[PDB]
Amino acid sequence: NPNDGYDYMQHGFDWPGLQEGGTTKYPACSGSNQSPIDINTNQLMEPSSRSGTSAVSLNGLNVDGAQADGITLTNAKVDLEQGMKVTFDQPAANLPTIEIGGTTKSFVPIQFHFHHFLSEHTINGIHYPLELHIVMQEQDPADVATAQLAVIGIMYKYSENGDAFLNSLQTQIEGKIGDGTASYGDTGVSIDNINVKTQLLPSSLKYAGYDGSLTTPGCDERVKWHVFTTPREVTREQMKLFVDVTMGAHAGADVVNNRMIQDLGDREVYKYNY
Ligand code: NA
Ligand SMILES: [Zn+2]
Helix, strand or coil: CCCCCCCCCCCCCCHHHCECCCCECCHHHHCCCCCCCEECHHHCECHHHCCCECCCECHHHHCCCCCCCCCEECCCEECCCCCCCEECCCCCCCCCEEEECCEEEEEEEEEEEEEECCCCCEECCECCCEEEEEEEEECCCCCHHHCCEEEEEEEEEECCCCCHHHHHHHHHHHHHHHCCCCCCCCCCEECCCEEHHHHHCCCCCCEEEEEECCCCCCCCCCEEEEEECCCEEECHHHHHHHHHHHHHHCCCCCCCCCCCCCCCCCCCCEEECC
16 A cells, blocks of 8 residues: 555566556566665775766765754654655755766755665675665756666664664654654654764765666666665664554555565676775
8 A cells, every 4th residue: 555556575576567558567677777786795896997977975964964064854754654754855055976977966865765674785695674765866957757866775784782863763753653643654744853974874984886776666777876885773673663654554565665686787886985
């Protein structure tokens, strides 16, 4: 019930073949620059060998939000259903940039969401219990439907010590469910402002970048991926929030919402800040 024309029962294995009225529903899900992928750290190439795309200048994302040129996601809201999407007022200053096809472009964070219980990307063949995707869109694109996107992927490994931001989100949500001001399935539920640098970015800026796609249909190949290789931490107790919210919203929802890894094909993956 959460997604419309597809689900995660086969982790997307079925997506490229779905047809309706003898017409293929998601032709781009069969492309050759699909995401997610495995990140083999011993095979990462040097950034200068990547044609057409530079490292991201994190700018305001990597400056304490309390600072003048630090970004704070404001008027933040979370959807109480699978993926727990968080939306907020569009940042307009200190935007991160990426030089693409020779042009430096600014990127605007538009939402962030989660892939819970199994990560979409793997690092050296290993999955993480949680992967956060901060989705950014190039500023003023020609058409929003075909806009260049940049996504930041952040992993969380199981640990005996949970993450601070996840704790706050869990506390806020569990509190609103408890006092009746929010119900599972509600969308755009208010939550506290978020300090990108202190609450979301991991402890090291090391990341793997490559050319990829959306990991949900239509799988459009318009994403510059930045997968940070140092994980944050999460406890099984914090992971319970995702099940409660996901099944509380739709009894038929898939609690493990990861698309399977895809063929790298002729792409290389590059290492940044190593
Ligand atoms: Na600030
Ligand atoms: Zn995602």
